[PDB]
C-alpha cells in the first residue's frame, strides 16, 4: 500500500509558526483506519518549506519525544502549541505506489465501503435511478474496493449488488458497470465464455484476450473459469477451434511462457531469429509448429529482440512475414500476438480506434478494453493513441458514445490528452 522511510526533522519556529497544517486524530481520522497525524499543507516561505525536509502527506510520529499515536486532534495540536521554538519532529515519508503506475483508475484514499454501498442503495432506491451517482462511485474506485462495496451491499440488503444493478440499469451502461464489478479473472473468464458460447466463435475477442494476457493472468483465468463453468478453458477452446489456430490458442492459454530471466540469451535470440526465417519466408510452405513453439514459449523481452534480429536475415519484418505466410484465423492470431509482444499499449490503442473509427461502435471491444486495462496500462494506451491518431482517446470516446454510458467510459479513460 505504502513505501515508508522515517526521518527526524529539527525546525526553528518562525514568527508565522512552523509553517504547516496537520490533520488526523482518533476523533477526525484522515482515512477509515489510521488515527495518525498528517501534514495536509506546507505554507510557502514557512520554516518547514525553507528547511525543505518535510513533505505534504508525511505522518508525524513524535514531537519532542512525545508520540502522536492514538491522540485526539486537539491533543495533537496542543503538543505543537506548547513545544517551544526548537521543535524536533520524527516523520514518516510515504509513497502511495501500488498496483500499476500506468493505470487510469487508482484506489480511492478516503475509502469507506459501507457508505458507498449505502449511497448506491440510495441511487437504486431513488425514483428513475441516480445512474450518475452509481457511475461517479464505481469508476473512481479500484477493483479491490469494488469488491468491498459488493460485500457491504450484500450484508445490508441481502441482495447481490450486481443483481440489483442488473435490474436498475440497462443498455451499454449496464454492461460497463457489471464488468467493473467482476474481478479481472472473472471478467476475462466470462468474456472468454461469451466468445465461444454458440456454434460459431467470436475469434476476434478470443484472440484479443488470449494473446494479451500474461502467465499470471491466464493461470488465474484458468482457475476461475473452471470454478464458474465447471469445465476447463482449454477444453472449450479445443471444441470451438480447429487447425493450427487451435494449436496456437491452446499453447497461449496454458500460460506457461518462460519468465524474463536476468541474463539476456543473445545466442538463443539469434537461433530463434534464424528458426523463424527457416520455417517461413525462406522455404516453400510454412513450418507452423516451429512458429508456435518459439512465439509461445520464449519470454516477451526475449521475443522482442528475436523480432529485431529476425530483420537481419529476412527482407520482411515479422508482421509482413506473417501476412505472406498464413491466412485466416491463424494469420489474425499471429498478427495480434506479435503486436502484444512488441507494444501492447499500442495494440490496445489500435483496437480502440478500430472499434470506433467507422459506422457505429464495436461496444463489446471498446467496453472490454476500457474495463480490463483501466488498472493496468491505460495511461500508456492513451499516450500511444494520442501520438498516433492526433486526437485523444477521450475525444474519440466522446464522439462515438453518449449519455451516462459515455460518462463511465470517459471516467475509465481517466482524462483528456
Amino acid at each position: 500500500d505504502y513505501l515508508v522511510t522515517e526521518e527526524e526533522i529539527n525546525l526553528t519556529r518562525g514568527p508565522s509558526g512552523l509553517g504547516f497544517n496537520i490533520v488526523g486524530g482518533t476523533d477526525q481520522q484522515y482515512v477509515s483506519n489510521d488515527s495518525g497525524i498528517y501534514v495536509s499543507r506546507i505554507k510557502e516561505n514557512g520554516a518547514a518549506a525553507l528547511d525543505g525536509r518535510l513533505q505534504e502527506g508525511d505522518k508525524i510520529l513524535s514531537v519532542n519525544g512525545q508520540d502522536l499515536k492514538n491522540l485526539l486532534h486537539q491533543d495533537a495540536v496542543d503538543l505543537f502549541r506548547n513545544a517551544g521554538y526548537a521543535v524536533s519532529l520524527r516523520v514518516q515519508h510515504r509513497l502511495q505506489v501500488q498496483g500499476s503506475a500506468y493505470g487510469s483508475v487508482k484506489a480511492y484514499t478516503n475509502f469507506d465501503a459501507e457508505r458507498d454501498a449505502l449511497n448506491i442503495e440510495t441511487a437504486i432506491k431513488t425514483k428513475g435511478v441516480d445512474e450518475v451517482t452509481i457511475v461517479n462511485i464505481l469508476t473512481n474506485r479500484s477493483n479491490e474496493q469494488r469488491q468491498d462495496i459488493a460485500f457491504a451491499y450484500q450484508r445490508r440488503t441481502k441482495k447481490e449488488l450486481a443483481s440489483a444493478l442488473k435490474s436498475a440499469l440497462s443498455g451499454h451502461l449496464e454492461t460497463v458497470i457489471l464488468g467493473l464489478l467482476k474481478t479481472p479473472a472473472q471478467y476475462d473468464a466470462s468474456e472468454l465464455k461469451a466468445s465461444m458460447k454458440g456454434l460459431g466463435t467470436d475469434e476476434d475477442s478470443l484472440i484479443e484476450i488470449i494473446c494479451s494476457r500474461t502467465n499470471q493472468e491466464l493461470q488465474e483465468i484458468n482457475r476461475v473459469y473452471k470454478e464458474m463453468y465447471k469445465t476447463d478453458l482449454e477444453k472449450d477452446i479445443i471444441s470451438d477451434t480447429s487447425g493450427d489456430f487451435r494449436k496456437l490458442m491452446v499453447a497461449l492459454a496454458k500460460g506457461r511462457r518462460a519468465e524474463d530471466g536476468s541474463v539476456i540469451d543473445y545466442e538463443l535470440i539469434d537461433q530463434d531469429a534464424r528458426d523463424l526465417y527457416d520455417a517461413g519466408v525462406k522455404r516453400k510452405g510454412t513450418d507452423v509448429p516451429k512458429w508456435i513453439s518459439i512465439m509461445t514459449e520464449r519470454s516477451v523481452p526475449h521475443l522482442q529482440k528475436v523480432f529485431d534480429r529476425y530483420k537481419s536475415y529476412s527482407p520482411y519484418d515479422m508482421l509482413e512475414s506473417i501476412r505472406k505466410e498464413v491466412k485466416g484465423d491463424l494469420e489474425n492470431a499471429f498478427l495480434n500476438l506479435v503486436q502484444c509482444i512488441q507494444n501492447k499499449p499500442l495494440y490496445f490503442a489500435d483496437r480502440l480506434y478500430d472499434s470506433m473509427k467507422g459506422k457505429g461502435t464495436r461496444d463489446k471491444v471498446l467496453i472490454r478494453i476500457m474495463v480490463s486495462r483501466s488498472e493496468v496500462d491505460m495511461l500508456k494506451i492513451r499516450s500511444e493513441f494520442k501520438r498516433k491518431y492526433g486526437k485523444s482517446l477521450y475525444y474519440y470516446i466522446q464522439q462515438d458514445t453518449k449519455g451516462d454510458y459515455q460518462k463511465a467510459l470517459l471516467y475509465l479513460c481517466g482524462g483528456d490528452d
Binding site: 509558526g17 497544517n21 496537520i22 490533520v23 477526525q28 495540536v77 502549541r81
Partner: peptide, 6 residues
C-alpha cells in the same frame, strides 16, 4: 478535515 495551523 480541520486543518490546524502549527
Amino acid at each position: 478535515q480541520s486543518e490546524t495551523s502549527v
